[PDB]
Amino acid sequence: ADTRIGVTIYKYDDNFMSVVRKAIEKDGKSAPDVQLLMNDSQNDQSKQNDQIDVLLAKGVKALAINLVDPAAAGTVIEKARGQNVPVVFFNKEPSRKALDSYDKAYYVGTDSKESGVIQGDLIAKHWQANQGWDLNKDGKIQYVLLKGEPGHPDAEARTTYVVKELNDKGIQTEQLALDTAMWDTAQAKDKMDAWLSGPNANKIEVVIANNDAMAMGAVEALKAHNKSSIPVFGVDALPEALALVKSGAMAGTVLNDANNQAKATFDLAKNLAEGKGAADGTSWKIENKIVRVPYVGVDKDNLSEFTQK
Ligand SMILES: [Ca+2]
């Protein structure tokens, strides 16, 4: 009657992982036979490694691990393997070799490349519809880009493929600046503030961000410089960001489906905790032990299908 599942979130105050954490908790409360043991790893992998030892000591039947460091997947797998405990890794993708080293290791995530392509499609759509955004009238987008953590799968794929998609759409681009703000609102506000105080400031046409939290910090810096007409694009469709698309402060974002990634992680973890096949009685398509949940483009034209206009 007491199926214990251990869950580690790499950082509880990452805005998107906060939506994922609350949706997994919602699913756990709704299943009468489950007890979720939730942990905040506080963005430190040593803290997470010790939390996994305490969870195994408490006799959890499955682990749902959102890694701090993707390279620590091996360390986690060996802790789990000794007790025959299945591990459903989520959000930060481990290596293929790491996933292949243990029959009971699974992954729930997304195809990183896809959100980059979708963001580039949105920017392309809106660029063509608002020729007044081309401030210097040269037919090229002069942009700045706010990147997430360097090395991170989603940060590298969204930076590469948003520009790639724009160029493939026949829109030439010129990068005025790019720097990491580590997925953080405050750090993004400061970097955008620096750029608006630098020599490139009058040349900026579009602000591209790897997530909505950083986009929200850029919107604040633009407000302060009375540059609120510069379009900002993000990724995740956070409720607060959807409010800005609704108000026109952001020009578009890409839904990162937190509720279905949460549901897939919970479903796979509970099945595997019960000795059943990972996808039993579900509609999740597992391919090579991986579930990928689609991104969806969001702007003012389909915004009612995600929030109230
Ligand atoms: Ca231009």
CATH number at residue 242: 3.40.50.2300
Q: Is the four-CA dihedral 234, 235, 240, 245 of positive or negative sign?
A: positive
Cβ atoms of 12 and 18 closer than 8 Å: yes
What residues contact residue 177 under an 8 Å CB cut-off, 6+ apart? 144, 145, 195, 198, 200
Q: If you compute the radius of gyration of the chain from its CA atoms, what whole number of angstroms results? A: 21
Are both 121 and 245 inside the same structural domain?
yes
The secondary structure of the chain, three-state, reads CCEEEEEEECCCCCHHHHHHHHHHHHHHHCCCCEEEEEEECCCCHHHHHHHHHHHHHCCCCEEEECCCCHHHHHHHHHHHHHCCCCEEEECCCCCHHHHHCCCCEEEEECCHHHHHHHHHHHHHHHHHHCHHHCCCCCCCEEEEEEECCCCCHHHHHHHHHHHHHHHHCCCCEEEEEEEECCCCHHHHHHHHHHHCCCCCCCCCCEEEECCHHHHHHHHHHHHHCCCCCCCEECCECCHHHHHHHHHCCCCEEEECCHHHHHHHHHHHHHHHHCCCCCCCCCCCCCECCEEECCCEEECCCCHHHCCCC
Domain boundaries, position 203: 111-256+295-309
Residues annotated in a binding site for beta-D-galactose? 14, 91, 152, 154, 158, 211, 236, 256
Experimental resolution (Å): 1.9
Are both 144 and 235 inside the same structural domain?
yes
Are both 104 and 156 inside the same structural domain?
no
- Helix 239-247 and helix 212-224, axial crossing angle in degrees, nearest 10: 40
Give distance in angstroms: CA of 201 to centre of ligand 1.
13
- C-alpha–C-alpha distance, residues 54 and 279, integer Å: 27
Are both 100 and 158 inside the same structural domain?
no
Give distance in angstroms: CA of 133 to centre of ligand 1.
8
Closest Cα partner for 197 from 144, 151, 149? 144
Are both 252 and 302 inside the same structural domain?
yes
Are both 181 and 304 inside the same structural domain?
yes
Give distance in angstroms: CA of 191 to centre of ligand 1.
21
Q: What angle do CA 89, 40, 115 make, to 5 degrees?
A: 50
Residues annotated in a binding site for Ca(2+)? 134, 136, 138, 140, 142, 205
List Cα–Cα distances, 77 to 104, 114, 142, in angstroms: 9, 28, 45
What residues contact residue 200 under an 8 Å CB cut-off, 6+ apart? 144, 176, 177
Gaps after residue numbers in the chain (C–N over 2.5 angstroms): none
Closest Cα partner for 33 from 262, 263, 274? 274
Neighbour order of strands in the sheet with 141-147? 173-180, 141-147, 206-209, 232-233
Method by which the model was determined: X-ray
Cβ atoms of 81 and 56 closer than 8 Å: no
Are both 234 and 120 inside the same structural domain?
yes
Give distance in angstroms: CA of 166 to centre of ligand 1.
14
Give distance in angstroms: CA of 123 to centre of ligand 1.
14
Cβ atoms of 252 and 118 closer than 8 Å: no
- C-alpha–C-alpha distance, residues 193 and 224, integer Å: 9
Give distance in angstroms: CA of 235 to centre of ligand 1.
23
Give distance in angstroms: CA of 142 to centre of ligand 1.
5
Are both 227 and 280 inside the same structural domain?
no
Closest Cα partner for 152 from 62, 43, 296? 43
Are both 304 and 229 inside the same structural domain?
yes
End-to-end CA distance of the chain: 45
What is the number of structural domains in the chain?
2
Give distance in angstroms: CA of 204 to centre of ligand 1.
8
Are both 194 and 83 inside the same structural domain?
no
- C-alpha–C-alpha distance, residues 257 and 195, integer Å: 32
Are both 299 and 153 inside the same structural domain?
yes
What residues contact residue 50 under an 8 Å CB cut-off, 6+ apart? none
Q: Is the four-CA dihedral 223, 138, 212, 250 of positive or negative sign?
A: positive
Question: What's the token pair of residue 234?
Answer: 């993000």
Residues in the chain: 309
Are both 58 and 205 inside the same structural domain?
no
Give distance in angstroms: CA of 157 to centre of ligand 1.
24
Give distance in angstroms: CA of 176 to centre of ligand 1.
11
